[PDB]
Amino acid sequence: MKYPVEGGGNQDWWPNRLNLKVLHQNPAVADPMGAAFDYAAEVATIDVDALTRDIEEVMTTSQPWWPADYGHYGPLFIRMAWHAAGTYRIHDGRGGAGGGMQRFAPLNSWPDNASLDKARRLLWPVKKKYGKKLSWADLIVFAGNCALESMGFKTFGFGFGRVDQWEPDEVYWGKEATWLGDERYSGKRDLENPLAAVQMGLIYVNPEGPNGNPDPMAAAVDIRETFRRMAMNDVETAALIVGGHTFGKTHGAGPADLVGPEPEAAPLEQMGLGWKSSYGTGTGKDAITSGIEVVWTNTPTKWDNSFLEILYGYEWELTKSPAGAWQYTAKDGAGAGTIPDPFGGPGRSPTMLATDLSLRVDPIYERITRRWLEHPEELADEFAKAWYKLIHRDMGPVARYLGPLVPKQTLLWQDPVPAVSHDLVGEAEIASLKSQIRASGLTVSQLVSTAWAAASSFRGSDKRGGANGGRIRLQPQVGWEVNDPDGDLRKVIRTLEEIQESFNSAAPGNIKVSFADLVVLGGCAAIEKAAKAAGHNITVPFTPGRTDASQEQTDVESFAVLEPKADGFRNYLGKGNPLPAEYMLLDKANLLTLSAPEMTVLVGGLRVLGANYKRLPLGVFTEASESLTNDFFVNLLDMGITWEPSPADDGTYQGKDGSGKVKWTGSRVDLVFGSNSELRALVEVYGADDAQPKFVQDFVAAWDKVMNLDRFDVR
Amino acid sequence: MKYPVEGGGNQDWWPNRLNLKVLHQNPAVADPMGAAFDYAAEVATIDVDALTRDIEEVMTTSQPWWPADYGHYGPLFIRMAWHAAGTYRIHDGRGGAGGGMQRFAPLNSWPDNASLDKARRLLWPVKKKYGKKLSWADLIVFAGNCALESMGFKTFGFGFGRVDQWEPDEVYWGKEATWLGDERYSGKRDLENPLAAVQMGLIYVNPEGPNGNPDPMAAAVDIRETFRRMAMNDVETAALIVGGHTFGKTHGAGPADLVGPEPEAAPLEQMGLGWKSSYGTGTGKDAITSGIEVVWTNTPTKWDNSFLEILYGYEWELTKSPAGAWQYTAKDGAGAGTIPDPFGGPGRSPTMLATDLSLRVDPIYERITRRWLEHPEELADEFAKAWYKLIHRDMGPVARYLGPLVPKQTLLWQDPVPAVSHDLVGEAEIASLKSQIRASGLTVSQLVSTAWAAASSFRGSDKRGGANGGRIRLQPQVGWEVNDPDGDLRKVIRTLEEIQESFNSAAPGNIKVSFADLVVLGGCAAIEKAAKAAGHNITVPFTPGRTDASQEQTDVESFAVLEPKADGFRNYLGKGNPLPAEYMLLDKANLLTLSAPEMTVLVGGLRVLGANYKRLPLGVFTEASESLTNDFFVNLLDMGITWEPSPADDGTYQGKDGSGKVKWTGSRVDLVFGSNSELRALVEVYGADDAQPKFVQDFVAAWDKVMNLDRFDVR
Ligand code: HEM
Ligand code: HEM
């Protein structure tokens, strides 16, 4: 129907086709910085004090195209940073401030991100000045952090290092094709996974209550659940809301239908800005953002205990903003004129959101916030910790945090591991340990499977998971179904621990090896063995330095979200997946940061290596198991085999030869490689007569990539 | 509405948004071959005689899942190769066999490409054997070439060198969202540009006549026009049809509604094959492809003059195939039983397509084909030339043609240039000529604009155009509006020719310089001057070796399709473009093979260098013209400027300062860089305080890329 330059493509003819473009997000060709650019090296040299002073100058210098409430952009920047981090969700680790995605579609145009187009624009002078040394990603959340400090709140600390991207991360935000739409609930009030907001285009909850019903008790149910899905418990949630609403104000001075198109739908002359309003001046005193007109505190540009003092110091009744939005105001005309106007007008009455009232109406929040009414030093502590968590939740390993403001204190939510406390294994010890593991009696399948299980727990969205920590032997990973706890896992763990004990006791010097490094090294040693069995003498690369986490360092509930409900690389498909197995394969590959060729070699290799869940024969298209051949690709392309869905409709297929005898069995994941025209092209590379050496090389490179995914300690 | 893995994206919320993804087609990460892979080096080593023998073995070994008509797959392979090349169109140079796109969506599933899924599958044994030394792209057309040779037709020659791609080239094939749909005609019978087929999913024309009306006279109008739009004249078109239909047969043994979904819509177990039929065996004697049941000649697997002898030797009446398709059969039961059955059945009567009858009904085709009736040696000659042209139209410069079968004869359609006949300019002569050109009195704008005009005529679709040939001084390029023939062009040409004369007559030795090299060197010398003026001492790279074409080597009407109706890099917008200027910019950048960063740096640089069409001030956001600064990017991000559409709605905009005074003017092309969220990210890179050196470096690299686009003689 359309030109490709206007978005036309093959999805128009086959709407539900597998989208392999999820495996080439942020292509190098789109990146203007060049091959040698290293943001970490750039931002490590930034003048943080000068940056802070420059941001402070921006916050207190009102611009005429978006005048600053109370002459201070601080609170606007706090909402900006909070919204940047607030898209994060635990189910897939996507969203968050990590890539500065708020500057791009669709997030830059979400109803809830109204006016943040101007907020980000205000900071161009800072980005202009610091250039390569400062990403928009870092700047957006640092501006929030500076705002807090500028207004009297001492933060816990700050880590730089968020890398800017050049195209939007494509994320599933829900099925609704209407802004603020809601088709994401089933049962009593079960919110659709992986979502963490109650309506399309909201950060968490509706500020007017569920579906616009301003019931604070019902609103709190939504607040609790959505914040839970963004890694915040009851104390953290309460801390963040009171901490945030200690500052600034909402904007709803006139009717919302006088507000123009969002940035992505706006005319060219608006230069990336949207929501142009025809109500009065359209800015400042006349500003409309949410459509609500609330100023929570008498000190909108100062940290103090005013929020809770006001919340508990008045009784509240339902009222309407100038734009017709529900909000609460103090009963009986109490506190008239006590709240300051953003541009020097007459004083105003106390006001709160329905969601603010949840904090005193909900029994759990009420106990927390009444305590803080009486002991505000506890609020300051909890808010510091929660805000720190909020703006860093998706940053991954602490090795990634850069700059002079990084606090010394490690935190449980960072999934910490011990520091390296001894000398690392060298070339000779690595060779020795590989030999010892091959002599241990552990099979190639066992070693490869275990190393895969450990390393493939990583997801590139929030950079959580991976083989560092040795968490495969700890809860919950040791009990995950896909890791098959009733199988050989505990035997493999025990054997590797015995080798660790032996090596550490036996070897003098100061060299010690971690269980974590041994899990990975076992996989590498087995792949070497299997490659030789296929007539290839290769060494699989290995980088030592992983350390062993304790159970105490491993939050079992937090780690729960990392459990695969599907892993096509092990031909595992559990219940509850939103899409057929082949789609879940690409999703898994996306999270592992794999390209299509990398995904392809890994599937083919792991199948013939025996890495399958429960050592099932599905996709094991070889006569020589435990040997690293390209047999999977050769057999998949064999026209002497006729494929048919299994008589038992179990998601499997039978591959029959000319006599009608079943030679192979496969899953949807297996067959998609021969059926999908773009994947088949890749299979035809690795299935050619000249391809075995290349396959082995590419498999080993891809394997090494997966083993090293969380290794920011050596990067 | 959908998961990204199922195709969901930002186009869903903003349907008509600029799709920057056209500037990162074939990303490196999707390519399984690796950085060092060199197809030219691999195919240079193939045993072409052994390859030919292996293809011949494939053609004569019937496979039971698609039995070979007459025991020979040759004619099926001719149709396959012909369809592979037959998507080509002159208006943008897109389509053609150049990238093996028939193996991917949407082409692999076009109604007209039915059964070619089996045709390509038959050749896997060959691809399997030769591997990296043989692309599918080369193999598909070479199989067609071999087919002809094996059945008694001596071809003109063959060039290898078509590189395989890993994702489909996304091309505009029409508006229609129904297969065989037709919404591409206006006026009397004006076909929509850039299209070269009469209905969606057809190669050229409907074999049953226009819109299924079997009028041979009307059909010829469609044949003439579509073939013209694929670079074939009347003789070539007639030669191709006669030559092709000398072989094989159509397939329509039963009703077409018994034919299953096309490959891209078919079930996984079919392993990339589609159109599975439940009519009888679904293959062989029961095969249905087009729905027509025609065998044109009594010798379907042999080259001879039987097609024209049959066409003219019988009278023809309208009939219907078993599938209900219009076709023609000999009148009065003449020639009963004279045509052989593909699988040894009873003989059949002579039959023809409505479009075959066009060849004797249309007055022009009738004169051509009646001649060949008596002079078949002329048919053989013309078909050899036309088939060669067909299979190589999109190959670009003859330097790209590889292997032992490339004929010596140069052809006009290949846009030939003389060989280098003397020694090339070295480092000293280059430096000397740069100095001479700067002393010549030609301005920076003149030199940069002329070199751009010449080089940017290149399109990466069929690799036609570019600065080699020096065709800027020849018809039609010298008269193109965008090149501004009334402006300084002729003056620049004359000056550079005088410098060429002077250098060639003055310098002794064996060194001579072409006008073509001087056009480009002038641009390079001027950008050096302009960089110096902005405080940068840089050398712009330059590679000599371009030669000078004569007007006789320059087909004026063939070159007509290379004329830009839009060039955003020069802020030129002519009439007749299908989309707004910013979309045409991206299309132009795609054809120049430019990334978004490269496009961005080029626009900013060319503006401040004065390269604009008619030296218009649109987008010239600088106080210092003819100096190479990043002023374009700095000023585009200036919030002190308010942009508004010009009072005269002429597609321009006014940028007013705080006083209300117009400081800048810009087009849609200029403003899209500040308006588009993804492009603005790129301008914020080159607009930063630290960005001048990087801008200059990146501009020079991108400039050098464009100057070198057609230079396959040095790669
Ligand atoms: C139940 C959760 C929350 C709800 C329903 C909510 C709702 C809102 C709404 C409707 C606005 C007005 C936007 C406008 O019209 O300008 C607002 C503003 C604001 N929010 Fe929240 N919010 C929540 C949590 C938070 C959190 C966690 C923070 C940060 C820690 C925060 C910080 C702010 C700040 C500082 C403003 C004032 C912005 C300005 O002065 O322009 N909020 N909030
Ligand atoms: C006016 C232009 C043309 C039209 C309308 C046309 C139409 C057709 C149709 C409908 C078929 C039947 C496909 C099937 O049912 O299996 C066919 C087959 C074929 N075409 Fe054409 N064609 C055209 C030009 C050409 C050209 C230019 C060539 C090659 C130079 C060619 C070579 C062939 C061959 C060799 C077959 C037989 C394939 C087989 O035996 O399986 N055709 N054509």
UniProtKB/Swiss-Prot annotation, chains A, B:
Formation of the three residue Trp-Tyr-Met cross-link is important for the catalase, but not the peroxidase activity of the enzyme. GO terms for molecular function: catalase activity; heme binding; metal ion binding. Coiled coil: none annotated. The record marks R79 as: Transition state stabilizer. Its cofactor is heme b. It catalyses: H2O2 + AH2 = A + 2 H2O; 2 H2O2 = O2 + 2 H2O. Keywords: Antibiotic resistance, Heme, Hydrogen peroxide, Iron, Metal-binding, Organic radical, Oxidoreductase, Peroxidase, Virulence. Heme b binds at H245. It holds the Pfam family peroxidase. The active site is at H83, W296. There is a cross-link at W82-Y204 (Tryptophyl-tyrosyl-methioninium (Trp-Tyr) (with M-255)). The keyword Repeat does not apply. There is a cross-link at Y204-M230 (Tryptophyl-tyrosyl-methioninium (Tyr-Met) (with W-107)). Homodimer. Bifunctional enzyme with both catalase and broad-spectrum peroxidase activity, oxidizing various electron donors including NADP(H). Protects M.tuberculosis against toxic reactive oxygen species (ROS) including hydrogen peroxide as well as organic peroxides and thus contributes to its survival within host macrophages by countering the phagocyte oxidative burst. Also displays efficient peroxynitritase activity, which may help the bacterium to persist in macrophages. Catalyzes the oxidative activation of the antitubercular pro-drug isoniazid (INH) to generate an isonicotinoyl radical that then reacts nonenzymatically with NAD to form an isonicotinoyl-NAD adduct which inhibits InhA. Belongs to the peroxidase family. Peroxidase/catalase subfamily. Many isoniazid-resistant clinical isolates contain mutations in katG, leading to abolition or reduction of catalase/peroxidase activity which results in lack of INH activation, or to a reduced affinity for INH. Other mechanisms of INH resistance include deletion of the katG gene, and down-regulation of katG expression due to mutations in the furA-katG intergenic region. This is Catalase-peroxidase.
